[PDB]
Structure formats: structure tokens, C-alpha cells
Amino acid sequence: KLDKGTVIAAALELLNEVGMDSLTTRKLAERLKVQQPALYWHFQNKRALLDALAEAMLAERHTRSLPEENEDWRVFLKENALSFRTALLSYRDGARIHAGTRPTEPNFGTAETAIRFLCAEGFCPKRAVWALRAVSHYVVGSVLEQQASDADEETDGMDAAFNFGLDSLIAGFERLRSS
Amino acid sequence: KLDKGTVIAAALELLNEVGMDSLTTRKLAERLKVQQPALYWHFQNKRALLDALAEAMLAERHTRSLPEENEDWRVFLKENALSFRTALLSYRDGARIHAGTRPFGTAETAIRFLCAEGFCPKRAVWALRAVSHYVVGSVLEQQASDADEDVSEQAPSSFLHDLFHELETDGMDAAFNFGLDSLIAGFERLRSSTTDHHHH
Ligand SMILES: CN(C)c1ccc(O)c2c1C[C@H]1C[C@H]3[C@H](N(C)C)C(O)=C(C(N)=O)C(=O)[C@@]3(O)C(O)=C1C2=O
Numbered sequence: 001k002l003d004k005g006t007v008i009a010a011a012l013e014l015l016n017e018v019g020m021d022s023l024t025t026r027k028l029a030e031r032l033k034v035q036q037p038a039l040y041w042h043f044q045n046k047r048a049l050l051d052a053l054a055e056a057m058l059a060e061r062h063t064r065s066l067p068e069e070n071e072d073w074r075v076f077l078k079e080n081a082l083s084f085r086t087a088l089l090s091y092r093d094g095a096r097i098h099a100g101t102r103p104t105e106p107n108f109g110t111a112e113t114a115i116r117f118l119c120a121e122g123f124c125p126k127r128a129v130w131a132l133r134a135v136s137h138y139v140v141g142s143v144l145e146q147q148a149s150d151a152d153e154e155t156d157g158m159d160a161a162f163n164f165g166l167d168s169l170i171a172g173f174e175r176l177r178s179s
Numbered sequence: 180k181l182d183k184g185t186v187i188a189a190a191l192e193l194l195n196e197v198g199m200d201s202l203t204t205r206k207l208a209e210r211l212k213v214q215q216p217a218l219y220w221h222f223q224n225k226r227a228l229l230d231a232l233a234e235a236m237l238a239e240r241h242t243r244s245l246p247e248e249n250e251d252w253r254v255f256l257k258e259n260a261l262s263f264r265t266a267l268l269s270y271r272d273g274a275r276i277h278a279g280t281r282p283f284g285t286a287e288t289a290i291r292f293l294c295a296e297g298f299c300p301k302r303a304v305w306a307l308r309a310v311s312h313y314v315v316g317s318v319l320e321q322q323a324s325d326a327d328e329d330v331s332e333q334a335p336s337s338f339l340h341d342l343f344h345e346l347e348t349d350g351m352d353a354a355f356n357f358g359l360d361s362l363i364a365g366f367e368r369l370r371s372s373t374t375d376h377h378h379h
Pocket residue numbers: 058062064065066080081084101102103107108110111112129130132133135136139330
């Protein structure tokens with residue numbers, strides 16, 4: 001009866017209310033109106049659930065995972081970074097939930113497509129990987145800072161700061177794509 | 180009664196043992212061998228303590244806060260970023276505790292420095308903030324990865340398997356350095372650009 005899709009859907013809703021710190025097995029089980037073992041069947045620990053949410057957030061919101069036809073690689077990385085940022089900001093503690101996670105089997109497929117697309121535009125395999133990792137780290141760090149300050153007590157400044165750092169990061173890749 | 184510096188020192192000590200989540204008022208009072216009211220005298224809540232820890236980490240480990248005499252602004256930003264990274268890496272949940280903290284004298288001094296190196300006041304702010312966000316992001320993911328328990332072994336394709344096997348002879352410093360060098364190389368170009376690079 002209770003499928004993995006329904007659990008994730010209920011968990012993302014509950015996450016936005018309580019946050020990742022207050023999100024527990026009992027709360028999610030009570031929200032789904034099931035006993036804890038039915039939920040434990042899907043996720044044996046909190047980290048396993050948060051990993052599934054991290055994947056779900058991108059699957060739902062992260063629209064620009066892959067390069068489009070006749071898209072400049074600089075435009076792709078900007079749109080990819082903005083799309084990734086939007087996905088983390090869409091849910092409470094999105095950046096902190098994403099932190100430490102390694103790509104899933106599909107994400108490795110999309111990552112390889114990104115790496116090969118950059119390699120075709122003059123990047124060396126190593127500097128393509130570092131560029132994509134550097135962008136993801138920059139976004140996670142920017143979103144964490146935004147979500148951290150919002151949790152406590154100028155968003156125009158964060159938006160302007162993010163866009164300038166992202167454009168700078170891409171402008172830098174142009175020069176340092178290959179030795 | 181104990182001074183604010185002694186509580187902060189003891190709190191930094193516990194942080195590296197138990198972590199942010201386990202850093203309770205009981206543990207800190209038991210460590211200092213005092214009653215809990217003694218702690219509440221200095222810090223009314225945990226966020227106030229974590230704000231003090233965030234500053235204390237930089238005061239302790241962050242050595243390159245200001246540029247040296249006749250130091251190139253690009254060299255400063257790299258050494259400043261590496262010094263800031265070192266400070267956050269030296270403490271459990273370092274990047275996580277820093278996140279959300281806002282300035283002030285040293286921050287304003289760094290803005291005026293870049294402002295004298297072909298930056299515009301807004302872009303000087305954005306540049307400094309952007310660097311800190313890249314470092315906070317890099318440290319958070321590394322600290323999260325080390326706390327939550329190989330990338331070459333998971334890779335389903337031969338291309339990624341072989342590539343990650345080579346990148347495991349470079350180190351994590353190589354990856355961070357490239358992103359930092361790219362970020363600063365970007366500033367060098369976009370600091371005096373007439374195009375809008377803070378929108379879209
Ligand atoms: C394969 N590859 C280079 C790695 C290796 C280790 C990693 O820890 C990661 C990657 C890929 C990058 C790609 C980036 C990509 N982007 C540059 C923002 C991205 O759009 C995605 C995505 N799901 O499309 C990521 O997963 C991503 O955020 C990510 O989480 C990564 C990531 O964490």
C-alpha cells in the first residue's frame with residue numbers, strides 16, 4: 001500500500017514545516033498514519049531518508065540538469081547553477097541535506113554528459129570535473145548562508161552576490177579550462 | 180565567576196569532541212565544573228554561543244584576514260580564502276556554525292582594499308561574499324562527507340572509473356584550488372566589466 005513515492009512526498013512537506021533537525025521517524029510515521037516499521041522498511045536511518053529527499057528535491061525542481069541543443073557551455077553552467085540553487089532553496093535546509101551526498105547512478109549519467117560536453121569545448125577531463133564540483137560547492141555554500149540567516153532573523157544582496165560569483169566562476173573557467 | 184574567553188575556549192574544546200548537535204549546556208557546565216547559570220550569564224541561548232565560537236575560530240586559526248604590504252590583490256584573496264578554509268576545517272561543524280553570521284572593521288578594510296584595485300564598491304562586497312560562500316560550501320560538504328562515513332568504485336562507466344582513479348592521486352586540495360583560482364581569475368575580468376553580471 002505505502003509506496004516510496006508517497007513517503008518522500010509526505011517527508012518533503014513535513015521537512016518544510018519542522019526542518020531537517022526536528023524531522024524524525026515518529027513524526028513522518030504519524031503524518032502518514034502508519035506504524036514506524038512500515039516507514040523503517042523504506043529508510044533504516046535518518047541519513048537514508050535525507051539522501052532520498054536530496055535526490056527527490058533535484059528530480060522535482062532541478063530542470064536544467066542536461067545541456068540543451070545549440071546551448072553555449074557558459075550559458076548551460078549558469079542555467080544549471082541557477083536551476084540547482086532554486087532546487088535547494090525550494091525546501092527547508094536543502095543545502096545542509098545535500099552536503100556530503102555523492103551522485104546517484106542517474107546523476108553519474110548526467111554528470112558524465114556534462115563532463116564530456118565541457119571536454120568537447122576545450123576542457124581537460126580533470127578540470128571539467130573540478131569546474132562542475134566547484135559550481136555545486138559554491139551553490140551549496142551560498143544557499144546554506146541564505147537558509148541559515150533566514151532561520152535566525154538583504155536578499156537582494158545575496159541574489160546579486162550569487163550571480164556575480166557564478167559569472168566570475170564561469171569567466172575563470174574560460175581561461176583555466178586547459179593548461 | 181569565569182570570564183567569557185574561558186567559556187568560549189572550553190566550548191571550542193567540547194565542539195571537536197562531541198560536535199555542534201551534542202554541544203549541550205550540561206556538557207559545557209560539567210567541563211568548566213560550574214553551575215548552568217554561570218554559562219547563561221554570558222550566552223542567553225545556543226545561537227549566541229555558536230556566534231562567539233564562529234568569531235573565536237577566526238581569531239584562533241584565520242591568520243590572513245588583511246592583505247600584507249605590496250601584496251597583489253589576487254594573491255591576498257587566494258591566501259585569505261585558504262586561511263579562512265583552514266579555520267573552518269579545524270573545528271567540527273565549522274562551516275555549518277559560520278553559516279548565517281554577518282559582520283566589521285576587517286570586512287570594511289577588505290572592501291576599501293579591493294576598491295583601490297579597480298573594483299566598484301558593490302562588486303568588492305559581492306567578490307568577498309562570493310569567496311566566503313565557495314569556502315563555506317567546500318568545507319561543509321567535506322565535513323559532512325567525513326562525518327557520514329570510493330567515488331571511483333561507484334562510477335558505473337569506464338571513463339569516470341579511470342578519471343576518478345587519476346583524481347585520487349591529485350587530492351581534495353587540487354579540486355578546491357581550481358575553483359578558487361577560477362573565481363579570482365573571473366574577478367580580474369568582471370571587476371571593470373560594463374555588462375550587468377549580478378542578474379539573470
Ligand atoms: C561526477 N562528479 C564530477 C561529481 C563527483 C562528486 C560530487 O560530489 C558531485 C559530482 C557532480 C556534481 C554535479 C552538480 C551539477 N551542477 C554543476 C550543479 C548538477 O547540476 C547536478 C545534477 N543532479 O544535475 C548535481 O548533482 C551537482 O550539483 C552535484 O551535486 C555534483 C556533485 O556533488
